[PDB]
Amino acid sequence: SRTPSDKPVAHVVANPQAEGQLQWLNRRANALLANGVELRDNQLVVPSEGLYLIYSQVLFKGQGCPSTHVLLTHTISRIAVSYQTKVNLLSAIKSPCQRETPEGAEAKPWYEPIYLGGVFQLEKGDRLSAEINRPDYLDFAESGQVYFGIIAL
Amino acid sequence: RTPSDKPVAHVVANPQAEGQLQWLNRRANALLANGVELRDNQLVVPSEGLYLIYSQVLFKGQGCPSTHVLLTHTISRIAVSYQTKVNLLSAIKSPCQRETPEGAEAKPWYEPIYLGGVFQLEKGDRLSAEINRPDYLDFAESGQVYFGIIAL
Amino acid sequence: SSRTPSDKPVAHVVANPQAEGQLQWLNRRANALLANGVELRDNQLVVPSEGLYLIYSQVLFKGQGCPSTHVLLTHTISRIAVSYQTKVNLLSAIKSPCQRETPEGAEAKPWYEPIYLGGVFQLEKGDRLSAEINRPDYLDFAESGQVYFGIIAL
Amino acid sequence: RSSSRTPSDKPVAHVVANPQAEGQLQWLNRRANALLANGVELRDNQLVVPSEGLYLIYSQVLFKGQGCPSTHVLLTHTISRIAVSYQTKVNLLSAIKSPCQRETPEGAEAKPWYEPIYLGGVFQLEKGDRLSAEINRPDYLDFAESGQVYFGIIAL
Amino acid sequence: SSRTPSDKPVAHVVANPQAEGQLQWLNRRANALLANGVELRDNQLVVPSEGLYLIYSQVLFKGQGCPSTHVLLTHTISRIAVSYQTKVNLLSAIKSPCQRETPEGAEAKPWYEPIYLGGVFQLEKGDRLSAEINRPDYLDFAESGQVYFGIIAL
Amino acid sequence: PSDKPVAHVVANPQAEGQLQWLNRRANALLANGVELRDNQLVVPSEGLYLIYSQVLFKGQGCPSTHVLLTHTISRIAVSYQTKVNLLSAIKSPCQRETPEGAEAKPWYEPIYLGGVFQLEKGDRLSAEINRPDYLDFAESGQVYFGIIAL
Amino acid sequence: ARVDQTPQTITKETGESLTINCVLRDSHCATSSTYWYRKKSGSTNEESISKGGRYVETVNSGSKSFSLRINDLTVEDSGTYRCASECQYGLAEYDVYGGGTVVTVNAAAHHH
Amino acid sequence: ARVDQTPQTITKETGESLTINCVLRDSHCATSSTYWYRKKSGSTNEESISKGGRYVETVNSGSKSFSLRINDLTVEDSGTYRCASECQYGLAEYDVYGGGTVVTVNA
Amino acid sequence: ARVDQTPQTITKETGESLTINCVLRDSHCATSSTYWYRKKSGSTNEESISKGGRYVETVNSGSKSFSLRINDLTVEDSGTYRCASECQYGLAEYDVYGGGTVVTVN
Amino acid sequence: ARVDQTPQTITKETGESLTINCVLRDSHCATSSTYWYRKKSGSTNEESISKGGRYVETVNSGSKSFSLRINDLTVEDSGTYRCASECQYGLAEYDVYGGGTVVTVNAAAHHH
Amino acid sequence: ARVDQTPQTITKETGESLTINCVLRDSHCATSSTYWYRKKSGSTNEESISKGGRYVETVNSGSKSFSLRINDLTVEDSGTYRCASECQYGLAEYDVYGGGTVVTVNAAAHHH
Ligand SMILES: [Cl-]
């Protein structure tokens, strides 16, 4: 360690060895978590009140979606000390299969990424969480395909 | 209790805005302070410096017609130095590959677009986040469509 | 005219429109920046000083018809550091633009796919960042700010 | 303290330029003596035809500048159509005008030039066609008074 | 004698050529119309029924040489309504025929500049439309249908 | 199924120094009885029509004296078989200052005419200009001509 | 759930008095900058209810709840009533809303 | 015309009450859909004045007039206040505005 | 871009076969009323290419594309070839063209 | 439209002088560092035209316009010509371009 | 004539802001040594306007013109205002002047 550098910061990436779950990690190469940011239950805990930049990306992969009725979601939520209800700050939905379902052929690997980012005023003790409804379609194979992070502006 | 900061803005789509994109600031988890004004659906930069501009839109439709809709989303800039609307960020997305479902109707599709970048803005510059088809907006749930700038 | 000085390492490079089958990054164009020490060498950004940076890039893919079998669109920002001289992926995304529908006696139709990547990272002096795509033949830089790549020292 | 029992018609629109739109051409409909009714919708500064049929398209713009410091300035005004059958911008009506033919106000100034441009024609439009009236130099617009810049269609 | 009936409020009036320096609207000339209720009062058209109308007018200005630099020719169609008793412009145009010049050493330079106006509007009963110009001393109503003004109920 | 006679003809761009009207072009109409005979539109039914035409003039310099650009829509009727002007306009493009041994300055001047008239069966309308050497048919919809029975 | 309007469905008689209570759950909103809005049955216009006379408002800042007692009820007072509050913390300023429907019946006016 | 603000320039002291009157001249605009907007002196953030508390709105349908009483004037209640109305006749629907400046001096 | 002729400039050898493809983008144009025209190098007169024998035309209505394969190539064939189609929707009847030049050496 | 090259298509004969004019619309670009590029018909080289002799460059800062007069025109001077200018405000430095093509025919050389 | 003041006579009201512009005609005078002078109505001494606060000075180097915007107008700022500039070529040093008069009217006059 040479130069100090500061601000609450976090850039966590999904655990590749979790398969059917999205577990956030910080001890893996180009990942960061320092200066007060806590990771409790896959939740980032704000250490100080101020303006933050919140972002997250998720990559979905399925092997030839046979079901027209497929819905993929990705949302970053906030539970604050002032108002103790989970509300979505950033949200996105994506329909991966436009009915087109493989009939007389073989599998069709589809990939769908979703990216979210925004600036918010957060308070001390706020709990941020990035979650998806289909954690069985997670593709954490490669490296920077799924992540979640904040930086104090 | 905690002191303010720097020019910032995070505006959200109006949920009760019938088929149109009106940006709002006086709603939960939204900001517009430290000089940034929202004029006629436009953000006005109050001071010279480097800003980070971003916006997301969620498009939803209840079926794939034959028209072949093209979804566009661009953040453009009108500067005091060059009084022409020029695009800073843009993206295009075609939602329908389907050969118009003739028996399996409805089937709601969802398509998002996210834009973000760093730019140098001048005093009085007007940024505008716009889309070509404001009739496919999904401003139903919170924070699905938004637009913001922050002075870095 | 002159108002405020401004500072910190920043870069926002945009693809060259007069380039064919290539993603060549340019800095000497209207709303593009490359100042405060950031160097653009071999289609690569060279970090001039250690700190926390914000990295982002967008790519727009377009084709006028659906091709055969499955084509995969890739977009990754990589980093080769002085500390570890091997290129590792910081951000990645894959996207399938053509879902079956291999045109066999049917009309072609232009598809568009954007891909965006962004995150905060700690970079050192002399690190070489590069944003690249696997199929530079589907690039749609026919309009402005549709493909770009940038960093800013926070 | 009055009464009204007035009827209606067929797709029509007559929109007027925004006066408080700094150096830009924003089309408005919620202003006196302006129309946008019977299905014609205004999206992204574009009119969307609500039904297929025979239409009359017209538009005027007024250009004003406060001096001629360039014998090489071009003012153009075009009504273009991007159609559902052919998703390409094609010109329906166009006109070009050179506002400054002289050798620039080299001595005294305050010579405001005014040059108007008018377009009109009948066309066959389909449902979902998007019509757009545009100019090349939106910095010379004279929207100071009323009914100086306008754009409209009417279903014949 | 007459032939097929035809209807709708209609008007196409032409300037009086024998009026020297003024704009008098006439209907008793070959290709001019004024029928089905449209009244021309004090050089003003009175709408006979509520509905949508098409308004148009052309004025041709001619001068023999340019005297003033600050010469502005205007042409407007105005409306004073029963609901709002103030004359407001529906269509307007301004034109400067002379860019400085002011011929000192020359032999007179006759200029011709026309102005055309048109639009569709909703009019009420008793509204008065009026076509007016600021300088009726430059009117060129010589050869033919060079100056005219009309409405038609669409 | 749209009735009422209509016509909207546009100039031929590959026509050497002449104003030839075309109807089998992208955004052009000639239907419900209006025929284009000898470069003239023939009205098929008696009634009220809206007549319009625009011409765009372009030149690469101001030659000697003044050029008068005229644009006129004429009507020759079965009742009175002489060509008479329904709409006319004149414009002088050159404000003197002929190029004094220097370089050119391309001028553009368009002219538009429009109005409502009563036409009878067999009337022949023609939109015409005096200098077909200044026609700018380079782009589309810069010179056109049409009627519609309202 | 960010202000809680309690009386959802009410059916009262002409000549009565309904009191509607709203409770703040966001600790940044104040009971001082409160507003009330009604939407009369059959119309799509949200009108601004006035502070005075027949519409009396009782506020208690301790529990962060405010109420609105309405007297002399007729049959034209059937509509959707919402409550509002002005919140302010850091650089943030926002407002909150609720929801609730009213139905009023009549007394028939017995004729001898 | 098109709505007429009567008190054009007023100058009152902190702690008082000014009334602004607007009169309809268009018989298609209604005294029912009236709106108010304020612009604080030296700032172009024209906001929508809310009807309640210090801002009371009186409507009289007979004379086609609406007014806006402002109570407890402060030194920050100095600006430019405009009124608005929604008009609708046949196929046309539009809105109209006025103009008039307020300056409050503090004691 | 209403009809899209694909092989813009081709340079072939005597005795081969060039295929020129045109795809309709105006959904009002029909693959049934297709025409071909040639401009022989040095002459400025167009002519109607005949469908038969050495000029074979393949049309596919599904893909809205038609092509013209010319076999047994000689040196008198160097010229600019255009394709055409007759479109008809409502009250409109028009035609569309393209462009593409061929050079054959011996 | 960030500098506007005005004579788009010009057609001169061997032995002439064509003027190409560009006017700046970006208030950040300066008339001091101007460059010209010509691309000879059929090749994609866009070599840089030099300021001197047959290529005379006239600059006027008042109207923010520059031109490039080419005299003694031959048939080897036919190509697409672009103008350029160097812009710089805060941390940004860029350049701007235009467009315009020339076609030159000969004089037929009447042989006695 | 060297130096041309554009606003000759102005009559603004108390509480407003006037800008007076001057244009240089001699190519020996510089927009760098510009000065402004006011002469209060009723007195003879011409005072030197200090650029700061209410007196802001703008410059445009392309056309060699400078202006002077005066904000927060009072009624005691009525007078004859002149602009000045310092010219210097070879063995010569001189200055140039203009002219332009101001009348500012006040308020009250509440006609009862
Ligand atoms: Cl009536």
mmCIF file of C-alpha atoms in Angstrom, chain D residues 3-145:
data_model
loop_
_atom_site.group_PDB
_atom_site.id
_atom_site.type_symbol
_atom_site.label_atom_id
_atom_site.label_comp_id
_atom_site.label_asym_id
_atom_site.label_seq_id
_atom_site.Cartn_x
_atom_site.Cartn_y
_atom_site.Cartn_z
ATOM 1 C CA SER D 3 -74.200 28.001 -24.609
ATOM 2 C CA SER D 4 -72.407 25.842 -27.168
ATOM 3 C CA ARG D 5 -73.637 23.029 -29.429
ATOM 4 C CA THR D 6 -70.962 22.830 -32.208
ATOM 5 C CA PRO D 7 -70.099 19.719 -34.282
ATOM 6 C CA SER D 8 -66.839 18.048 -35.386
ATOM 7 C CA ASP D 9 -65.114 16.684 -38.515
ATOM 8 C CA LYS D 10 -62.192 14.694 -39.973
ATOM 9 C CA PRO D 11 -58.467 14.412 -39.112
ATOM 10 C CA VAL D 12 -56.972 17.908 -39.043
ATOM 11 C CA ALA D 13 -53.981 19.718 -37.520
ATOM 12 C CA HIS D 14 -52.628 23.285 -37.615
ATOM 13 C CA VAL D 15 -49.768 23.741 -35.165
ATOM 14 C CA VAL D 16 -47.815 26.919 -34.473
ATOM 15 C CA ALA D 17 -44.173 27.378 -33.511
ATOM 16 C CA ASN D 18 -43.200 27.843 -29.860
ATOM 17 C CA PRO D 19 -42.330 31.495 -29.117
ATOM 18 C CA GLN D 20 -40.455 30.745 -25.844
ATOM 19 C CA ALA D 21 -38.273 28.005 -27.428
ATOM 20 C CA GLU D 22 -34.816 29.580 -27.586
ATOM 21 C CA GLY D 23 -33.358 29.231 -31.071
ATOM 22 C CA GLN D 24 -35.452 26.148 -31.802
ATOM 23 C CA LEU D 25 -38.592 25.062 -33.693
ATOM 24 C CA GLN D 26 -40.966 23.377 -31.222
ATOM 25 C CA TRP D 27 -44.470 22.708 -32.540
ATOM 26 C CA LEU D 28 -47.386 23.628 -30.276
ATOM 27 C CA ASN D 29 -51.106 22.858 -30.295
ATOM 28 C CA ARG D 30 -52.471 24.256 -26.985
ATOM 29 C CA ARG D 31 -52.496 27.873 -28.130
ATOM 30 C CA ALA D 32 -55.191 30.163 -29.543
ATOM 31 C CA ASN D 33 -56.186 29.548 -33.183
ATOM 32 C CA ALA D 34 -54.317 26.238 -33.312
ATOM 33 C CA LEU D 35 -55.747 22.798 -34.008
ATOM 34 C CA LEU D 36 -54.775 19.180 -33.374
ATOM 35 C CA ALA D 37 -57.886 17.010 -33.354
ATOM 36 C CA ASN D 38 -59.722 14.000 -34.811
ATOM 37 C CA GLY D 39 -56.772 11.669 -34.327
ATOM 38 C CA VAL D 40 -53.710 13.574 -35.537
ATOM 39 C CA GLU D 41 -51.060 13.185 -32.826
ATOM 40 C CA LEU D 42 -47.821 15.161 -32.374
ATOM 41 C CA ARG D 43 -45.004 12.935 -31.130
ATOM 42 C CA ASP D 44 -41.347 13.967 -31.499
ATOM 43 C CA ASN D 45 -42.018 17.260 -33.299
ATOM 44 C CA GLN D 46 -43.717 15.055 -35.912
ATOM 45 C CA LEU D 47 -47.329 14.636 -36.988
ATOM 46 C CA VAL D 48 -48.650 11.060 -37.074
ATOM 47 C CA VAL D 49 -51.367 10.427 -39.664
ATOM 48 C CA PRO D 50 -54.315 8.652 -37.970
ATOM 49 C CA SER D 51 -55.976 7.250 -41.102
ATOM 50 C CA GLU D 52 -55.148 6.510 -44.728
ATOM 51 C CA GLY D 53 -56.452 8.967 -47.273
ATOM 52 C CA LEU D 54 -55.936 12.118 -49.283
ATOM 53 C CA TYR D 55 -54.259 14.935 -47.343
ATOM 54 C CA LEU D 56 -53.247 18.560 -47.872
ATOM 55 C CA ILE D 57 -49.838 19.412 -46.383
ATOM 56 C CA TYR D 58 -48.692 23.007 -45.881
ATOM 57 C CA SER D 59 -46.117 24.924 -43.839
ATOM 58 C CA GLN D 60 -44.570 28.394 -43.661
ATOM 59 C CA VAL D 61 -41.478 29.641 -41.826
ATOM 60 C CA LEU D 62 -40.234 33.215 -41.491
ATOM 61 C CA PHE D 63 -36.489 33.814 -41.481
ATOM 62 C CA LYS D 64 -35.032 36.974 -39.986
ATOM 63 C CA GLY D 65 -31.427 37.975 -39.512
ATOM 64 C CA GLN D 66 -29.903 41.179 -38.197
ATOM 65 C CA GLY D 67 -27.336 41.652 -40.958
ATOM 66 C CA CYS D 68 -25.872 39.900 -44.021
ATOM 67 C CA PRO D 69 -22.237 39.131 -43.052
ATOM 68 C CA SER D 70 -21.988 36.261 -45.565
ATOM 69 C CA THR D 71 -22.800 36.126 -49.282
ATOM 70 C CA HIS D 72 -22.726 32.250 -48.920
ATOM 71 C CA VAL D 73 -25.661 31.502 -46.571
ATOM 72 C CA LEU D 74 -28.413 29.029 -47.546
ATOM 73 C CA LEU D 75 -31.929 28.903 -46.059
ATOM 74 C CA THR D 76 -33.927 25.722 -46.761
ATOM 75 C CA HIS D 77 -37.329 24.450 -45.627
ATOM 76 C CA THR D 78 -38.636 20.929 -46.214
ATOM 77 C CA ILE D 79 -41.646 18.783 -45.360
ATOM 78 C CA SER D 80 -40.490 15.160 -45.439
ATOM 79 C CA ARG D 81 -42.270 11.843 -44.968
ATOM 80 C CA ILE D 82 -41.148 8.628 -43.289
ATOM 81 C CA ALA D 83 -43.761 6.057 -44.239
ATOM 82 C CA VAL D 84 -44.804 2.670 -42.907
ATOM 83 C CA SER D 85 -44.214 1.074 -46.325
ATOM 84 C CA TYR D 86 -40.752 2.648 -46.786
ATOM 85 C CA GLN D 87 -39.027 3.634 -43.512
ATOM 86 C CA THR D 88 -36.793 6.261 -45.136
ATOM 87 C CA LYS D 89 -36.933 10.047 -44.978
ATOM 88 C CA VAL D 90 -38.147 11.283 -48.375
ATOM 89 C CA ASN D 91 -38.871 14.893 -49.282
ATOM 90 C CA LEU D 92 -42.432 15.777 -50.262
ATOM 91 C CA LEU D 93 -41.980 19.558 -50.461
ATOM 92 C CA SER D 94 -38.732 21.520 -50.444
ATOM 93 C CA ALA D 95 -37.532 25.031 -51.198
ATOM 94 C CA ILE D 96 -34.205 26.843 -51.071
ATOM 95 C CA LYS D 97 -33.629 30.565 -50.640
ATOM 96 C CA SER D 98 -30.496 32.672 -50.454
ATOM 97 C CA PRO D 99 -31.247 35.525 -48.032
ATOM 98 C CA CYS D 100 -28.132 37.634 -48.525
ATOM 99 C CA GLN D 101 -27.180 38.546 -52.091
ATOM 100 C CA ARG D 102 -25.298 41.733 -51.184
ATOM 101 C CA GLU D 103 -21.702 42.427 -50.120
ATOM 102 C CA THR D 104 -22.348 42.380 -46.338
ATOM 103 C CA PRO D 105 -23.225 45.376 -44.116
ATOM 104 C CA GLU D 106 -19.590 46.503 -44.044
ATOM 105 C CA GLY D 107 -20.384 49.996 -42.779
ATOM 106 C CA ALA D 108 -23.547 50.578 -40.784
ATOM 107 C CA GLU D 109 -25.726 47.676 -39.684
ATOM 108 C CA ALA D 110 -29.307 47.243 -38.461
ATOM 109 C CA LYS D 111 -30.479 45.901 -41.795
ATOM 110 C CA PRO D 112 -32.878 43.128 -40.770
ATOM 111 C CA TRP D 113 -33.716 40.872 -43.674
ATOM 112 C CA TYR D 114 -36.946 38.912 -43.716
ATOM 113 C CA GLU D 115 -37.393 35.967 -46.069
ATOM 114 C CA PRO D 116 -40.453 33.708 -45.845
ATOM 115 C CA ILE D 117 -40.826 30.249 -47.371
ATOM 116 C CA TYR D 118 -44.115 28.473 -48.052
ATOM 117 C CA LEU D 119 -44.824 24.846 -48.971
ATOM 118 C CA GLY D 120 -48.025 23.143 -50.062
ATOM 119 C CA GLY D 121 -49.274 20.012 -51.746
ATOM 120 C CA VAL D 122 -51.732 17.126 -51.754
ATOM 121 C CA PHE D 123 -50.503 13.610 -51.050
ATOM 122 C CA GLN D 124 -51.663 10.086 -50.384
ATOM 123 C CA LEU D 125 -50.704 9.131 -46.840
ATOM 124 C CA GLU D 126 -51.140 5.885 -44.962
ATOM 125 C CA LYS D 127 -51.858 5.213 -41.312
ATOM 126 C CA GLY D 128 -48.786 5.827 -39.176
ATOM 127 C CA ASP D 129 -46.897 8.013 -41.639
ATOM 128 C CA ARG D 130 -44.895 10.621 -39.727
ATOM 129 C CA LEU D 131 -44.635 14.059 -41.341
ATOM 130 C CA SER D 132 -41.991 16.566 -40.259
ATOM 131 C CA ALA D 133 -41.420 20.232 -41.122
ATOM 132 C CA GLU D 134 -37.819 21.325 -40.612
ATOM 133 C CA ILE D 135 -35.371 24.091 -41.508
ATOM 134 C CA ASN D 136 -31.603 24.019 -41.853
ATOM 135 C CA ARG D 137 -30.800 27.091 -39.707
ATOM 136 C CA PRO D 138 -33.087 27.232 -36.635
ATOM 137 C CA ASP D 139 -31.218 30.350 -35.464
ATOM 138 C CA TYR D 140 -32.932 32.664 -37.987
ATOM 139 C CA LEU D 141 -36.504 31.927 -36.888
ATOM 140 C CA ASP D 142 -38.839 34.891 -36.356
ATOM 141 C CA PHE D 143 -41.475 33.526 -33.980
ATOM 142 C CA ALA D 144 -41.804 36.888 -32.224
ATOM 143 C CA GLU D 145 -45.283 37.629 -33.509
#
